Design an enzyme around this catalytic site. Structure first.
Site, PDB file in Angstrom:
ATOM      1  N   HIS A  44       0.805  -1.220   0.000  1.00 29.75           N
ATOM      2  CA  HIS A  44       0.000   0.000   0.000  1.00 29.75           C
ATOM      3  C   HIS A  44       0.837   1.268   0.000  1.00 29.75           C
ATOM      4  CE1 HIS A  44       0.575   0.055   4.458  1.00 29.75           C
ATOM      5  NE2 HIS A  44       0.464   1.360   4.286  1.00 29.75           N
ATOM      6  N   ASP A  93      -0.523  -7.472   2.120  1.00 27.07           N
ATOM      7  CA  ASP A  93       0.088  -6.162   2.015  1.00 27.07           C
ATOM      8  C   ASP A  93       1.600  -6.272   2.089  1.00 27.07           C
ATOM      9  OD1 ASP A  93       0.468  -3.474   1.936  1.00 27.07           O
ATOM     10  OD2 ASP A  93       0.011  -3.185   4.080  1.00 27.07           O
ATOM     11  N   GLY A 186       3.546   6.858   8.681  1.00 27.33           N
ATOM     12  CA  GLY A 186       4.915   7.121   8.278  1.00 27.33           C
ATOM     13  C   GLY A 186       5.822   5.941   8.553  1.00 27.33           C
ATOM     14  N   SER A 188       4.725   2.727   7.974  1.00 27.77           N
ATOM     15  CA  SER A 188       4.338   1.622   7.095  1.00 27.77           C
ATOM     16  C   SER A 188       5.541   1.134   6.313  1.00 27.77           C
ATOM     17  CB  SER A 188       3.257   2.034   6.086  1.00 27.77           C
ATOM     18  OG  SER A 188       1.955   1.961   6.628  1.00 27.77           O
ATOM     19  N   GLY A 189       5.599  -0.167   6.085  1.00 28.21           N
ATOM     20  CA  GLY A 189       6.735  -0.700   5.356  1.00 28.21           C
ATOM     21  C   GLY A 189       7.908  -1.019   6.267  1.00 28.21           C
TER      22      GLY A 189
END
Lengths: 237, 57
Positions: A44, A93, A186, A188-189
């Site tokens: 995402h 995801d 911020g 995410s990932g």
């Protein structure tokens, strides 16, 4: 990251910062170095991103301030997103960023080991979430990489906290019952590093969560061990 | 509706620059979208947002 503390330089060698240059340069997401040319991150994160040309991966970073026009970075050659991804909430995801050149492992940037279905008596009790995310719902990107120790919560227990979603087995949650610490916008990932046997394992990828650090509202991460086969396959020529 | 919903970032934790139409201001404005969820009042560009929700151009 919410309820955490400033990290020290070289503390999380695998943590990178993904920047976008459009419309302007700014931190978009976090990501983990799993290969000398491979960054594991969230699918995402590339919402809307049409071309990997606007992407920039910065390794060995502690303070966002360190990024400048002269600062070296890794360009992305290809964005590989799981063919079953539809909505972060539903799962799948996960995404691989294939850099244009290889990374030279150093004390400030190294690969983090992947979990294995072949591991024994795996009990993660030393987990950490890192990132330059917000420190409170409606905040701003931090300059210094933030870290926070967060306890894993069973899938069952998490399924109860999220009566709106379907916490599948391909997801993993983490957070205190009373909240206070969690990942935020911020992050995410970013990686969800946990200590196994003196070795760091990329247990999860920061995906989502209702709010940030809310009580009875744990952070939800992509359960990496469930995608190892995908990663190996996609990392292969 | 599509041009009347409040900008919602969603449960996802990413930093995605997007646009939504502000009824009070009568024009489109920026906001950070999390990457998933949210609502129809979420556009990639100001012009597109204005094309769908803007006034007679």
């Amino acid at each position: 990251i919410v309820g955490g503390t400033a990290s020290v330089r070289g503390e999380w060698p695998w943590q990178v910062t993904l920047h976008t240059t459009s419309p302007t340069q700014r931190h978009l997401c976090g990501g983990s170095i799993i290969g000398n040319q491979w960054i594991l991150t969230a699918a995402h994160c590339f919402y809307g991103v049409e071309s990997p040309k606007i992407l920039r991966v910065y390794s060995g970073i502690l303070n966002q301030a360190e990024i400048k026009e002269d600062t070296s970075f890794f360009g992305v050659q290809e964005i590989i997103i799981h063919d079953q991804y539809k909505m972060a909430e539903s799962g799948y995801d996960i995404a691989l960023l294939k850099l244009e050149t290889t990374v030279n492992y150093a004390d400030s940037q190294r690969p983090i080991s992947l979990p294995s279905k072949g591991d024994r008596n795996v009990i993660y009790t030393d987990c950490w979430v890192t990132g330059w995310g917000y420190r409170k719902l409606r905040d701003k990107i931090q300059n210094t990489l933030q870290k926070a120790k967060i306890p894993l919560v069973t899938n069952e227990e998490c399924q109860k906290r999220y009566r709106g979603h379907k916490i599948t087995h391909k997801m993993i949650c983490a957070g205190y019952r009373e909240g206070g610490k969690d990942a935020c916008k911020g992050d995410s990932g970013g990686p969800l590093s946990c200590k196994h046997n003196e070795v760091w394992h990329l247990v999860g990828i920061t995906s989502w969560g209702e709010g940030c650090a809310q009580r009875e509202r744990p952070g939800v991460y992509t359960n990496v061990v469930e995608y190892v086969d995908w990663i190996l396959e996609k990392t292969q020529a | 509706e599509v041009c009347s919903e409040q900008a919602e970032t969603g449960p996802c934790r990413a930093m995605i620059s997007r646009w939504y139409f502000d009824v009070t201001e009568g024009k489109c404005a920026p906001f950070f979208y999390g990457g998933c969820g949210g609502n129809r009042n979420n556009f990639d560009t100001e012009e597109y947002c204005m094309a769908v929700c803007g006034s007679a151009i």
